[PDB]
Amino acid sequence: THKMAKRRIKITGTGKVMAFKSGKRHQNTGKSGDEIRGKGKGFVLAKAEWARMKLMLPR
Amino acid sequence: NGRDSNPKYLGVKKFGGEVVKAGNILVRQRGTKFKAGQGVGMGRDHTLFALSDGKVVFINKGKGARFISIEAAQ
Amino acid sequence: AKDGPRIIVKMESSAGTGFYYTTTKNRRNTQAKLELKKYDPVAKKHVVFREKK
Amino acid sequence: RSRLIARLPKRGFNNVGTTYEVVKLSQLQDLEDTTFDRDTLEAYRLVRRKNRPVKLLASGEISRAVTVHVDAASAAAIKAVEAAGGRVVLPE
RNA sequence: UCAGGGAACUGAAACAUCUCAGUACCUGAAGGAGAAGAAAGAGAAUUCGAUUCCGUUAGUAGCGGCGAGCGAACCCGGAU
RNA sequence: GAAACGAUGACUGAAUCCGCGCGGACCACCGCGCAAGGCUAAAUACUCCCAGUGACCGAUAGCGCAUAGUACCGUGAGGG
RNA sequence: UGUUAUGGCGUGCCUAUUGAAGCAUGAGCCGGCGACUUAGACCUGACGUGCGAGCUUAAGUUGAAAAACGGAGGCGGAGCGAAAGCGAGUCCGAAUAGGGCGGCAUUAGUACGUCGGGCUAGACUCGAAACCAGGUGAGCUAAGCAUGACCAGGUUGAAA
RNA sequence: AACCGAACCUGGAGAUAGCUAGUUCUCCCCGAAAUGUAUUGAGGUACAGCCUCGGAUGUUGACCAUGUCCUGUAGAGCACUCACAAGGCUAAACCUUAUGAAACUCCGAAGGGGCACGCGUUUAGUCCGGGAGUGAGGCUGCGAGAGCUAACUUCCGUAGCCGAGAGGGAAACAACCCAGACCAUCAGCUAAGGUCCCUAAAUGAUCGCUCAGUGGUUAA
RNA sequence: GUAGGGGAGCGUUCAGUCCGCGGAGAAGCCAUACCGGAAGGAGUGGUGGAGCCGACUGAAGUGCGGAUGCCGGCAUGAGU
RNA sequence: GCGACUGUUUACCAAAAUCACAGCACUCUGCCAACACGAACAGUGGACUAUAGGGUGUGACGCCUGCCCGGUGCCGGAAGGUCAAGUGGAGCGGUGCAAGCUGCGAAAUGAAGCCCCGGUGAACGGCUAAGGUAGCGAAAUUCCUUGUCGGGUAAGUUCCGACCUGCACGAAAGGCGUAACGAUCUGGGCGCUGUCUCAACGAGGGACUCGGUGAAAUUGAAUUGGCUGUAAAGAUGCGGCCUACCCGUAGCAGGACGAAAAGACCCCGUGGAGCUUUACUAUAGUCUGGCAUUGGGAUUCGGGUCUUGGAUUUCUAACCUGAAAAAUCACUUUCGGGGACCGUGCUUGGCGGGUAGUUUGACUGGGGCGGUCGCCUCCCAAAAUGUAACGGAGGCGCCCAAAGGUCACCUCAAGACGGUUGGAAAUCGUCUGUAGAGCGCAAAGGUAGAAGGUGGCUUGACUGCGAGACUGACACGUCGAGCAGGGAGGAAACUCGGGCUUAGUGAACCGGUGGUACCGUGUGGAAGGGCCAUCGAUCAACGGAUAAAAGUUACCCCGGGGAUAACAGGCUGAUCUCCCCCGAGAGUCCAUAUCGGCGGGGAGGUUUGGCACCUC
RNA sequence: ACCCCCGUGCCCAUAGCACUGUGGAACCACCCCACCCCAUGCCGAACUGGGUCGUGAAACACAGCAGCGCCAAUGAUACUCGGACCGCAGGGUCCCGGAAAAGUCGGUCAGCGCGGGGGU
Ligand SMILES: CC(=O)C(=O)N[C@@H]1/C=C(C)/C=C/[C@@H](O)C/C=C(C)/C=C/[C@@H](O)C[C@H]2OC(=O)[C@]1(C)C(=O)[C@@H]2C
Ligand SMILES: [K+]
Ligand SMILES: [K+]
Ligand SMILES: [K+]
Ligand SMILES: [Mg+2]
Ligand SMILES: [Mg+2]
Ligand SMILES: [Mg+2]
Ligand SMILES: [Mg+2]
Ligand SMILES: [Mg+2]
Ligand SMILES: [Mg+2]
Ligand SMILES: [Mg+2]
Ligand SMILES: [Mg+2]
Ligand SMILES: [Mg+2]
Ligand SMILES: [Mg+2]
Ligand SMILES: [Mg+2]
Ligand SMILES: [Mg+2]
Ligand SMILES: [Mg+2]
Ligand SMILES: [Mg+2]
Ligand SMILES: [Mg+2]
Ligand SMILES: [Mg+2]
Ligand SMILES: [Mg+2]
Ligand SMILES: [Mg+2]
Ligand SMILES: [Mg+2]
Ligand SMILES: [Mg+2]
Ligand SMILES: [Mg+2]
Ligand SMILES: [Mg+2]
Ligand SMILES: [Mg+2]
Ligand SMILES: [Mg+2]
Ligand SMILES: [Mg+2]
Ligand SMILES: [Mg+2]
Ligand code: NA
Ligand code: NA
Ligand code: NA
Ligand code: NA
């Protein structure tokens, strides 16, 4: 899907998922301190395969 | 009633003799069972942790007050 | 985190010049009017900071 | 779309403006007797792309005096060519 | 081949959009082919310069209960 | 959707030379082009028919048929 | 070798299952027919091969008892970020904490062929109640309309 | 127009089918699983565990010993909570005596687990990458709940075995006991179990028991 | 040792190439006590009356016990 | 008993109590009628017209037909409240030197409806808007029930007549009664009868035999015994034992869980179809406003500077329709009437199961009903962690400007003794007191050097980050030293990035607000888009499907399942049945001639069940 | 070197409570005053500022005392790792190791440091 090219799986030099954090951003929040300020990166070594098979070609 | 339940966890994570690192979590608990010794800090949830490198050390003074220290190698 | 007419509310944060939110759970239960404080926004800091919407 | 695919907090914004051609500095320096880069003879220097402009980036280091006529160039590139001899020409 | 009219199963691990698909079917008209065609264009170079087909662009831009999934054009080569 | 433009049913209804349309609401600038008339080889598609060819079958294959839309079935379309 | 007498031993096959000789499923027999393929310069991997920091062409043209020409284009080559952009560095950031990338003591690819597998098509084969379009049917049957035909004989005995 | 809670024929159409069945030649090697989590998920799928193949790493694997640390089950105990027997005292508390506890703990094993190392024997693990199957097991011993301390019962933990496991034994009889099939052989020794006869093997030896056919279906 | 993964090969048709066989006679069928670790192959005989083995390589419309499979032929229920 | 009757209907298992029926009632319809067929203001059917036609209900006849309209439906009234397009245009915003060229967008006004008032019940419907008038009544309504009594019979659960406690009788979904009617239903009686105790004889066509002709279902292979046990728990192929020469014919149907139909019950499948409604959604249809076809003459009301509009009224060349002469029309004409309406086209809103496309969860010792899904605390949990049940208990979906940060200071529950509105506790005082209290809520752990209680000062309930670890398949979640820009409390070391911790919450998509300026398709802006923050979530089927949704099927279909129920068998033996032990006591005296309080120990596999073992 | 006191640790009940005795100006405490710095939501009780006498009573220190607490064997037993069995069952046994609790004997009301002060 084209909603994948704009999904947090960028084709990095190596070939893994360039994730982020889905804890809480837009709604349902207001507690904790810097829980929302967790707008960093994320990575996984068990789904890189069944995710890159949809965006690999159009890197 | 059958309804209701909870996975829970807790326990000990770094046992005595082990070589910790700056940030390793030592023991998880609810209250203050294991008090922060020398070389060992304490989180909101009484979760013990290590400040630097070293070795895990248990100390018991007849129950009641538990202590965990870290003896550096070097 | 329900949201109805019930007492207490989620509050926006303003500032003297500063344009920053703190997000705080207040309550109209007791003293409910002086929602002013001091939260330095990215800036020089020390800015008069009232969450009072 | 119910397995990780969806549920990822990403909106971003697609633009895709201008992608410049990475011309490594060792390609000019090191080997070669200076064939004069210009904008036509350089095609034989293994930088055939077309449709896009040209960019000059410093990576190889061997001081040498060579003239460079690329479309655009970096801060460190220009301060590495004229530092050993040459002149980085940019379009008016 | 063009034109008029115009489904559903199916998919969406259900189903009202969308897909299927403007497909099947129906009807009208013509030929050894039609359609299309001589710019109130394409497009960004103050450029190419009828139309159609092939390759490429490219599965890109974009579209989509932003889901399934659908999906150009210009530049250029070539038939003519 | 910020949604242009083309098209169309129903209501309205401009100019034309210091003119008109367009260039993804809009405006200025800039740039391209000038409708409301028509016709027009070739490249393209398909194939009843013909020739040739085959790492195509050799008849429980191959078209359905080594001839037959015949025997046979149904009121019929049709099946075969 | 063929056949037999006798002793010992010995719970059809397949499927589906925790478990089959199953008193579970399938099968009269035999011959024949019959089930993991094909396509997309698709994606990915193993192997092999010809180039090698380069690697090939598609359409097509001219020739075909044979093949070359054709470099529009694609993959190598620099990454990082939402993007501008910057660049061996960039994004968060008001400069130092980290993530991603080079440099790591060190690692090049691409084209084609075969093959594993994925994607998209009916995708191992056979099979349902159903939905939709077009068309054929009232010579069976349920009715209407028009026009013809048929109901031995006997009994009871209304109005007027 | 012989079978209508929506006719027939043709076409879309080889509709879909988490369904059922079937799925064809050969040997060699390894070798599963029916668990966790998620699911309009429960007889289906994703991921993980578990399998195989290649490369790299190349002993970090395994068992065991030693040392160290941690966890409150069995048991027990009455010191907290609840319950509870007799008596004294003057209902409660207190005292003497005596108790019971998954949700009591003054105490507290075996065992287990993590880590370090190897004093020792063996052998594998991990990482990357291609392809999988399996996500409906059953019983027995032991430790629990549920059930009438019933069920070839259900639901968990754990060991073995069945599952994909032939052979011998238990009359027959996956699950039990003993044992893991490379093949060939008119060879030998053994295990579990037996050695009168029908099947191979001492109608064996010594000292007792039961007059019963107990063995060869149970209790107050 | 099942699902499964891996390895080495047999057989069939078509094709290129090579050595050939065939009227004193191929393929096919039929009998068999030989050979190879399996898939299989060979010798001889009988039948038959025109074409077809082996080796290497390539390409699939490639290997049957089953699907209440399909087609054809022939049985049992019975001389009922 | 029912239905009045004649009649009629499920071709092919229901001819009946169904339907129809004359009769009655409500209600619509002014005639291009209402209504209906239809792509079509065509055409036709109603139909060549108000005791005529359509629809509905009841279903001859006789006596009759109550109470309640809250709601729903409908009719009528209708001040007001709300409501679409449109009319109208202030304000706001963008671009340009400007003229100007363009987005967003009101107050008011604006149709049918809805809300609101009343009425209508042979309207749905009830017997909170009121509650059973007549009649009937255990009647086809009957549960407990075979009710009670009476009649018939030697004996009656049904039948008839009454009573009454009418589980749920009831006056047009009509109540009650009724002559006649009936291949209808029920009971009794007479007659007769091989219907029966009970079979017998006789016959005729077939079975039997011979000659001729010659099938079908089925079929893994067969050399195919009985008893017991075992095996998936129903044995001819297993074991043991017993019996049993080989091979037919005529016959009986116990077995081969016999043959036919992949089960029509049941469950499953995010299978199908038909049918319902106040499930969702749309549409035929229909009502309505505006705008065309669509004009003329006046009055009032609006206003600007000749008119532009709304309404009322009236006339007529459009249009519609009728008659006469050449029935359908085209034609010209006398005219007749309606006539700016209607019709029709576009558009707006409402109504809408007539029609259409679909949804309607799962777990579950079958399913349904009930109950229950997330998170938190103990127990189960078998001394790491983890570990299930429809196992045993109890909570949460918040709260707090302070219960926060920090800085200082205080120490509890309870008992005893003595004291005043007390007289139990409590207020006060003094001792004892490892705290047997407290910590906002559930529970555990933990706390006396406090995470118990107070006071001063403050807004660290900060921002930019985070080595390294715990935990999960993933996604999430959890702890955290240190560093930086700035602050808070204390003299200070130092601590603080919410509250003793563990629940007080939820992905993505979409959108709102502030901020900042990255993009912005010729350029420069702008719309918009991104980013930072943050808001909207009983999405509680709480890893969540759609922006948007309920039932029925005995008229049912299909794909499956002994993977899942009801029959049976099997396992078990709560229950059921029986036996046995002890013995108080009854039995005049006396435990045991008989009987056996309380309570115990077994057997059987005939009850109701459990489980779901082989057969769907 | 002897001893004592004071302050502060390790140790954190085998070093604790109770009872009793000893200590008087080196040390400690009470005590005295306290309008102000400071402070008890009331009290200078406790904090606190300035300091004689008196006393050691209380507190504290030390010593005896161990009635009570605490600590706690040996032996045996419960249970269990391993192996091997029995009953229809609830259960239970043998072999080999490890090994409680409680109770009893008994044990002890500490010991070990640093600094400062005053005495012989
Ligand atoms: C009550 C019951 O007891 C009952 O409803 N029993 C079921 C059989 C029925 C209803 C049969 C009805 C007859 O109209 C046809 C008879 C049938 C089809 C008999 C089928 C039989 O051979 C198999 C089973 O069928 C069942 O499903 C059934 C569960 C059953 O007990 C049978 C053993
Ligand atoms: K031969
Ligand atoms: K005969
Ligand atoms: K049975
Ligand atoms: Mg999902
Ligand atoms: Mg076609
Ligand atoms: Mg066998
Ligand atoms: Mg059989
Ligand atoms: Mg069978
Ligand atoms: Mg079956
Ligand atoms: Mg007559
Ligand atoms: Mg018919
Ligand atoms: Mg099919
Ligand atoms: Mg093998
Ligand atoms: Mg399972
Ligand atoms: Mg299990
Ligand atoms: Mg299996
Ligand atoms: Mg006969
Ligand atoms: Mg009588
Ligand atoms: Mg009749
Ligand atoms: Mg006779
Ligand atoms: Mg037998
Ligand atoms: Mg018979
Ligand atoms: Mg079935
Ligand atoms: Mg079925
Ligand atoms: Mg445990
Ligand atoms: Mg979505
Ligand atoms: Mg029917
Ligand atoms: Mg089964
Ligand atoms: Mg049963
Ligand atoms: Na045609
Ligand atoms: Na189709
Ligand atoms: Na006879
Ligand atoms: Na419907």
Side-chain angles (χ1 to χ4, degrees), chain A, chain B, chain C, chain D residues 2-92:
Chain A
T1 183
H2 171 260
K3 198 67 184 61
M4 165 94 61
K6 41 185 173 179
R7 189 175 314 122
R8 88 189 186 190
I9 170 184
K10 294 301 187 185
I11 307 299
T12 181
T14 297
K16 58 186 304 179
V17 177
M18 302 301 301
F20 284 83
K21 192 174 184 177
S22 67
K24 22 196 283 181
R25 179 181 64 180
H26 9 290
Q27 38 79 14
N28 283 62
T29 166
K31 290 72 62 179
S32 185
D34 301 38
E35 183 179 3
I36 314 297
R37 311 313 175 111
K39 295 297 301 180
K41 301 281 81 61
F43 308 95
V44 211
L45 304 175
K47 1 168 303 181
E49 177 183 0
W50 303 274
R52 66 185 179 183
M53 296 182 59
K54 308 171 61 183
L55 183 50
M56 179 183 300
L57 182 53
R59 59 178 57 182
Chain B
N1 287 16
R3 62 180 295 275
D4 87 78
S5 160
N6 288 322
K8 35 195 175 181
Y9 276 111
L10 297 171
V12 175
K13 298 295 174 197
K14 296 302 178 171
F15 295 99
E18 294 175 31
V19 174
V20 287
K21 198 176 174 185
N24 284 352
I25 293 173
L26 281 63
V27 178
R28 284 185 174 267
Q29 53 178 17
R30 294 299 171 75
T32 305
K33 173 175 190 67
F34 295 89
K35 308 175 181 185
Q38 183 185 352
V40 181
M42 171 182 299
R44 197 175 60 170
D45 66 343
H46 295 255
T47 292
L48 300 183
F49 60 95
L51 298 306
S52 58
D53 291 40
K55 192 181 51 180
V56 185
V57 170
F58 284 83
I59 305 168
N60 177 76
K61 297 182 185 298
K63 299 297 173 180
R66 285 288 184 186
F67 290 87
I68 313 171
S69 290
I70 299 174
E71 304 183 354
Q74 300 295 346
Chain C
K2 190 196 65 178
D3 313 275
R6 67 176 183 179
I7 69 264
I8 99 147
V9 184
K10 290 57 175 179
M11 290 306 303
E12 299 178 352
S13 302
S14 64
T17 299
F19 331 79
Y20 148 141
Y21 311 114
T22 299
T23 298
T24 288
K25 179 143 58 181
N26 307 163
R27 49 235 40 250
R28 307 164 308 188
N29 328 92
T30 65
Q31 286 290 357
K33 195 95 305 186
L34 291 165
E35 303 173 0
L36 344 172
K37 293 176 178 180
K38 179 260 179 184
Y39 285 83
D40 54 354
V42 299
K44 185 66 170 182
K45 317 292 192 171
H46 230 99
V47 317
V48 175
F49 211 85
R50 57 98 185 272
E51 297 128 330
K52 201 170 186 176
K53 49 110 58 203
Chain D
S2 180
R3 308 169 274 175
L4 303 174
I5 295 297
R7 214 213 299 204
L8 228 49
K10 176 186 191 166
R11 201 160 60 177
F13 171 82
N14 184 253
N15 186 338
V16 183
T18 311
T19 304
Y20 297 87
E21 270 61 19
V22 178
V23 186
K24 182 174 178 178
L25 183 52
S26 67
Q27 301 292 346
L28 289 182
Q29 290 180 359
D30 183 29
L31 305 192
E32 302 295 60
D33 311 352
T34 307
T35 72
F36 242 59
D37 319 339
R38 302 181 176 183
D39 63 331
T40 299
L41 296 177
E42 54 182 16
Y44 291 88
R45 302 185 304 93
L46 194 55
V47 301
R48 55 179 175 185
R49 283 303 295 175
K50 299 181 175 185
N51 180 272
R52 306 170 171 181
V54 188
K55 173 72 63 177
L56 173 70
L57 309 176
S59 305
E61 303 183 356
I62 167 180
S63 180
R64 176 186 183 176
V66 286
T67 298
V68 179
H69 296 352
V70 296
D71 198 320
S74 46
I78 296 179
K79 298 175 189 179
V81 179
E82 297 179 2
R87 183 177 180 180
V88 167
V89 176
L90 304 176
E92 300 179 357

